[PDB]
Each structure stands twice: as structure tokens, then as C-alpha cells.
From Swiss-Prot, chain B:
Record-annotated disulphide pairs: none
Protein name, entry field: Small nuclear ribonucleoprotein Sm D3
Gene from which this protein is expressed: SNRPD3
Similarity-based family: Belongs to the snRNP core protein family.
The organism of origin for this protein: Homo sapiens
Keyword Repeat: yes
Subunit text: Core component of the spliceosomal U1, U2, U4 and U5 small nuclear ribonucleoproteins (snRNPs), the building blocks of the spliceosome. Most spliceosomal snRNPs contain a common set of Sm proteins, SNRPB, SNRPD1, SNRPD2, SNRPD3, SNRPE, SNRPF and SNRPG that assemble in a heptameric protein ring on the Sm site of the small nuclear RNA to form the core snRNP. Component of the U1 snRNP. The U1 snRNP is composed of the U1 snRNA and the 7 core Sm proteins SNRPB, SNRPD1, SNRPD2, SNRPD3, SNRPE, SNRPF and SNRPG, and at least three U1 snRNP-specific proteins SNRNP70/U1-70K, SNRPA/U1-A and SNRPC/U1-C.
Full protein: residues contained: 3 to 85 of 126
GO CC entries: catalytic step 2 spliceosome; commitment complex; cytosol; methylosome; nuclear body; nucleoplasm; nucleus; pICln-Sm protein complex
Other comment: In the autoimmune disease systemic lupus erythematosus, antinuclear antibodies are developed with Sm specificity.
UniProt entry tagged with the keyword ATP-binding: no
From Swiss-Prot, chain C:
Tissue specificity annotation: Widely expressed.
Recorded disease: Retinitis pigmentosa 13: A retinal dystrophy belonging to the group of pigmentary retinopathies. Retinitis pigmentosa is characterized by retinal pigment deposits visible on fundus examination and primary loss of rod photoreceptor cells followed by secondary loss of cone photoreceptors. Patients typically have night vision blindness and loss of midperipheral visual field. As their condition progresses, they lose their far peripheral visual field and eventually central vision as well.
Domains as described in the record: The MPN (JAB/Mov34) domain mediates interaction with TSSC4 and SNRNP200. Has structural similarity with deubiquitinating enzymes, but lacks the residues that would bind the catalytic metal ion.
Name of this chain's protein: Pre-mRNA-processing-splicing factor 8
Location of this chain's protein in the cell: Nucleus; Nucleus speckle
Organism of origin: Homo sapiens
Swiss-Prot record, chain D:
More info: Patients with the autoimmune disease systemic lupus erythematosus (SLE) have autoantibodies directed against some of the individual snRNP polypeptides. The most common autoantigen is called Sm. B/b' bear Sm epitopes.
Pathological condition linked to this protein in its record: Cerebrocostomandibular syndrome: A syndrome characterized by severe micrognathia, rib defects ranging from a few dorsal rib segments to complete absence of ossification, and intellectual disability.
All copies of domain Sm, residue ranges: 1-79
Protein's UniProt name: Small nuclear ribonucleoprotein-associated proteins B and B'
Whole-protein coverage range: 8 to 89 of 240
Transmembrane segments: none
Protein family membership: Belongs to the snRNP SmB/SmN family.
Quaternary state and interactors: Core component of the spliceosomal U1, U2, U4 and U5 small nuclear ribonucleoproteins (snRNPs), the building blocks of the spliceosome. Most spliceosomal snRNPs contain a common set of Sm proteins, SNRPB, SNRPD1, SNRPD2, SNRPD3, SNRPE, SNRPF and SNRPG that assemble in a heptameric protein ring on the Sm site of the small nuclear RNA to form the core snRNP. Component of the U1 snRNP. The U1 snRNP is composed of the U1 snRNA and the 7 core Sm proteins SNRPB, SNRPD1, SNRPD2, SNRPD3, SNRPE, SNRPF and SNRPG, and at least three U1 snRNP-specific proteins SNRNP70/U1-70K, SNRPA/U1-A and SNRPC/U1-C.
Organism from which the protein derives: Homo sapiens
Curated annotation (Swiss-Prot), chain E:
Native organism taxonomy: Eukaryota, Metazoa, Chordata, Craniata, Vertebrata
InterPro entries: Lsm7/SmG-like, LSM_dom_sf, Sm, Sm_dom_euk/arc, Sm_G
Descriptive protein name: Small nuclear ribonucleoprotein G
Family: Belongs to the snRNP Sm proteins family.
PANTHER family assigned: SMALL NUCLEAR RIBONUCLEOPROTEIN (PTHR10553), SMALL NUCLEAR RIBONUCLEOPROTEIN G-RELATED (PTHR10553:SF26)
Gene Ontology terms for molecular function: RNA binding
Cell location: Cytoplasm, Cytosol; Nucleus
Protein role: Plays a role in pre-mRNA splicing as a core component of the spliceosomal U1, U2, U4 and U5 small nuclear ribonucleoproteins (snRNPs), the building blocks of the spliceosome. Component of both the pre-catalytic spliceosome B complex and activated spliceosome C complexes. As a component of the minor spliceosome, involved in the splicing of U12-type introns in pre-mRNAs. As part of the U7 snRNP it is involved in histone 3'-end processing.
Keyword Ribonucleoprotein appears in the UniProt entry: yes
A GO CC term assigned to this protein in UniProt: spliceosomal complex
Main location: cytoplasm
RNA sequence: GGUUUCUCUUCAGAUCGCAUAAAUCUUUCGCCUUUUACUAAAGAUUUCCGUGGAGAGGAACAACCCAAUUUUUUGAGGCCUUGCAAGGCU
């Protein structure tokens, strides 16, 4: 029926060596820091685009003191990456947002 | 190593009663119990064969010369055996 | 026992390998269900590539993200087998043929 | 032969001639015994002594007896269910 | 197995020793072996009369040791 | 007592499937003469290519060693007084 296989470890090392042209050279996960699925989900929900990443259609589609510009200390700008990383801190209204894996 | 011995070591730190081969009765805290039943205890009350009591700070009784020990009832309530 | 053998460096090497290499045993998979390039577009596009290729990477990631969002687990339904029903009839016979031979028949019969 | 009587209520006779009755829960190589809900009797083992059945009975509780000082054992009553 | 008795705590302390035969002596622990045989220094026999007599440094065989009691704090 | 291999029934919780299609309906969008065919997001419901657990029947391949202290190879027996028990004894 050819349904299950079990191999010995020299077999697996030979196959692993022969397949290396198609395989990645990453050992851990941190390469995909803001490039994982959860970052892309959050990005889609906030209508923001990571620079390499996909772009979608938006999900969501007055004079005030809280938003005033005389009170702001513009030290660094807030990038879009920061809003993906700490979504509840840098967004008013985060709906359907996913928290990303912090670090391994 | 015997099943009763493991249960004895379990009573270390508890108040226990010990009768010797000569019938003197020692009640107090079990500090150390060895494999051969050698027993170190503290703050003892001893009740002799005549009925009289005394008080001792520190004692050590040889296992062979122990007739028996009473352990806390709560501690007993081993199951696998 | 020795401290290490010939297999030791390789056996340690397989602990940090990507799937399915990291395992000893498994179920055989369908040939089509193994993309083999999914990891290439899940990484950053290399530097210096032209605009069409850079955009290409974004589109492949887009479809990857939409499949992952929209997924709901499979509904447990009464399966039916079409070919087993055909083979139960006396009208369908069965044989073993070369793939090219069968392919030619498919072409002729469709015509 | 020992494992059979485990969990049962058992009448144990000591070398000085005391009677220890308790629930037989454990033993070992030396015949050191673990006796739950154990009482000690001195004067008699009653067979329905019309005068009284129980004199010099003492409640002990959870007892570990050393095998050196054990002589013999018989079945006194069935296991308590608890 | 071939265990030591746990007596290092009692080393060089004054002790009260109850022996078989209703015998009692007092002295300073100077050493021991796996059989619980003891070396006791400045030993004194506490005669049943109440009178006490100095016997010096002695060996007590662990066999005949019923009980010991420290006269010090360990 | 086993393994392999076909057909059927039933239950599917599990990344049911380290993969991924289509259709229908409702909302919003983009196309702009009308309808096919459509653009792209959300939600709901189906179909299709595959899978897992359990049960029944058929066929094929293998087989009926511890007596010298701390326990179990003994400090073991004998005398006196009172109401077997306690104590003093040898």
C-alpha cells in the first residue's frame, strides 16, 4: 500500500546531504521575526505592510486635545514595524490582531 | 531496603513514641532514623517501668534494642505495596 | 563504549535539520502535496533582484497568508468512492499499462 | 503466605507475651510489621469471657513492630473497607 | 551497607550510656566503628548504690549498648 | 496466537491534509450600456481531490548464593514475697 516508512540514520544523513540545494540554511526561527504568519495576520488586520510582505485590502474600511501636535516630542518616528511588534501599545483600535512570538 | 523502613524514614521530623527491649518508653521528635533502626530523637519524655517520668533534650537508641515504634496516625493514611 | 563513532556528527546534524529530515519515520505523502519551494518564498527576497522578481515574492507570500487565514478544519463527511463503484460493475475491466499508452488513449477518447 | 493476609486485621504475639491487634499493612525480610489502628492487650485474647472480654487494653494507633520480637500471627478479622 | 552509625554529631561530647544488665556509665565520646562499638574517655561507672567510680578511657561493645543520651547540646 | 492485501459499514474529535481547489448566498469594494465571464475582503453553507479510529467478510505468506553484634540459628534456663501480674534475685 506504501503508507508508512521508517528509516535508519545513515539513510537519513545521505538523503539530507543529497537534498541540500533545495533546503534552507536556517537552524532557528529568529530569521522570521516580523516575517512569520502572525506578523502577516496582524499586518493585514491593521492595513499596514511589512516592506517585503504582502498587501491586502483593508479589513475595517474632530478637534481634540489628545491628538495635539504642540504636545508631541518627536524623537524618533514610529515605524510600521513597531506597530506590528507591540500592537496594543501603538495602535488605537487593534481588532483581530495576533501577538507574535517574542524570541527564541 | 524494606517497606517498613521507608515508612520510618518518612516519620523523620515527626513526634514518635519508642519502646525499648527493656520497656522504657521514649516520646519526642524523631531527628534521624538509620536503615538498621538506629534512632536519634530530641526533647524527650521518658516513662520508666515503675511509671515515673523524666525529660531529656537529646537521645540516640540502637535499632536492635528497640522493641517497637508508634508513628503518627495521620502520616500512615505504602498503597502500592 | 567509545565516546563517538562515525555516525555521531551526522546524528547530531540531523537534530537541527528542517522537516522531514528531522524524523526517523512517517507516513508517505502525496507527490503533489510536497511543494519543495515553499521555503524559498517564505524568506526575504535576496538583494539586488529586479522589480518583477521582488514583486513575485510578495504575491506568493500573499497566497500563502490567505490559505493560512481562511483554513477551517475538515468536515467529516460520508465518503464515496467513484472508481470502486465502477469496478464493482461488469462494464469496467482493469489492467496495467504504460503511462504514455494510457495518455494517448485519453487523448483519442476525448477527441 | 504473608501477602495473603495483607490488609486484614491480625492478632500478633510478642516475645514477652503481649497481644498486638491491628490492620496488617506491610512486612519485610525481618518480619518487621506495619499495623494500622493497633491496640495492645495483656491479660486475655477474648473467646467471649462472660465476665468481660477486655482488660488492660491500650489504644496505640499506627505501629511499626520489629520482627526480632515477633513470635506468631493469626487472622483476627476481615479488612476494614475504608 | 556496612553503614556507619551517624554519631559524628556526638564526637567529643559528654554522654550518659545505658547498658544491658541495668548498668549505666558516663563519659566523653572519642570514637566508634560500624558495629557501634564505642571509645569512651574519662568514663565513670554509676553503681546501683548511687556511688560513682572513675574507670578512665574504655571500650564499650555496641552489642550491649541500649541507649545513649547527650549531657551536652549538639 | 501473527503479518500482508482487497470490499463494505460506522464514528471522526486531531495542523482530520507540516497541503490546498471550486460553487452558492449575504455584506461591503473595483470594473460601467445589459448579461455571461469578472476585480477583493469579511461571514455563512456545500461540492471535490486526500486522511485517521473501530468493526465484518474474502484472498496470500510464516507458525501450533545469609550460624560470630543491627533482626532468622539465642543469654537460652533455675530461686524468693504478696494480690497468672509486679518486683528482688542466681
Amino acid at each position: 500500500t506504501y503508507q508508512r516508512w521508517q528509516f535508519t540514520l545513515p539513510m537519513m544523513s545521505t538523503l539530507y546531504r543529497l537534498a541540500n540545494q533545495l533546503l534552507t540554511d536556517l537552524v532557528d526561527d529568529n530569521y522570521f521575526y516580523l516575517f512569520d504568519l502572525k506578523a502577516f495576520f496582524t499586518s493585514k488586520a491593521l492595513n499596514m505592510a511589512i516592506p517585503g510582505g504582502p498587501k491586502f485590502e483593508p479589513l475595517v474600511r474632530d478637534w481634540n486635545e489628545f491628538n495635539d501636535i504642540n504636545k508631541i516630542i518627536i524623537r524618533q518616528p514610529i515605524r510600521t514595524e513597531y506597530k506590528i511588534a507591540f500592537p496594543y501599545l501603538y495602535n488605537n483600535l487593534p481588532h483581530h490582531v495576533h501577538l507574535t512570538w517574542y524570541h527564541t | 531496603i524494606g517497606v517498613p523502613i521507608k515508612v520510618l524514614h518518612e516519620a523523620e521530623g515527626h513526634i514518635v513514641t519508642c519502646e525499648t527491649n527493656t520497656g522504657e518508653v521514649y516520646r519526642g521528635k524523631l531527628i534521624e532514623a538509620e536503615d538498621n533502626m538506629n534512632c536519634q530523637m530530641s526533647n524527650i519524655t521518658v516513662t520508666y517501668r515503675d511509671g515515673r517520668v523524666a525529660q531529656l533534650e537529646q537521645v540516640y537508641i540502637r535499632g536492635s534494642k528497640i522493641r517497637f515504634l508508634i508513628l503518627p496516625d495521620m502520616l500512615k493514611n505504602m498503597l502500592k505495596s | 563504549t567509545p565516546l563517538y563513532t562515525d555516525n555521531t556528527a551526522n546524528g547530531i546534524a540531523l537534530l537541527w535539520a528542517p522537516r522531514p529530515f528531522n524524523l526517523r519515520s512517517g507516513r508517505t505523502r502525496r507527490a503533489l502535496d510536497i511543494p519543495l519551494v515553499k521555503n524559498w518564498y517564505r524568506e526575504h527576497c535576496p538583494a539586488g533582484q529586479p522589480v518583477k522578481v521582488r514583486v513575485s515574492y510578495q504575491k506568493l507570500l500573499k497566497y500563502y497568508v490567505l490559505n493560512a487565514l481562511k483554513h477551517r478544519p475538515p468536515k467529516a463527511q460520508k465518503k464515496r468512492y467513484l472508481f470502486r463503484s465502477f469496478k464493482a460493475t461488469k462494464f469496467f475491466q482493469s489492467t496495467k499499462l504504460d503511462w504514455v499508452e494510457v495518455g494517448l488513449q485519453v487523448c483519442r477518447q476525448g477527441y | 503466605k504473608m501477602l495473603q493476609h495483607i490488609d486484614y486485621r491480625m492478632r500478633c504475639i510478642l516475645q514477652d507475651g503481649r497481644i498486638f491487634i491491628g490492620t496488617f499493612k506491610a512486612f519485610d525480610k525481618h518480619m518487621n510489621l506495619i499495623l494500622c489502628d493497633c491496640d495492645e492487650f495483656r491479660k486475655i485474647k477474648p473467646k467471649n469471657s462472660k465476665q468481660a472480654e477486655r482488660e488492660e487494653k491500650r489504644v496505640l494507633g499506627l505501629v511499626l513492630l520489629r520482627g526480632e520480637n515477633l513470635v506468631s500471627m493469626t487472622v483476627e478479622g476481615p479488612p476494614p473497607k475504608d | 551497607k556496612a553503614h556507619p552509625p551517624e554519631l559524628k554529631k556526638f564526637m567529643d561530647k559528654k554522654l550518659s550510656l545505658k547498658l544491658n544488665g541495668g548498668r549505666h556509665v558516663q563519659g566523653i565520646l572519642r570514637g566508634f566503628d560500624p558495629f557501634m562499638n564505642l571509645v569512651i574517655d574519662e568514663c565513670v561507672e554509676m553503681a546501683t548504690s548511687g556511688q560513682q567510680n572513675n574507670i578512665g578511657m574504655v571500650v564499650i561493645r555496641g552489642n550491649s549498648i541500649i541507649m545513649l543520651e547527650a549531657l551536652e547540646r549538639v
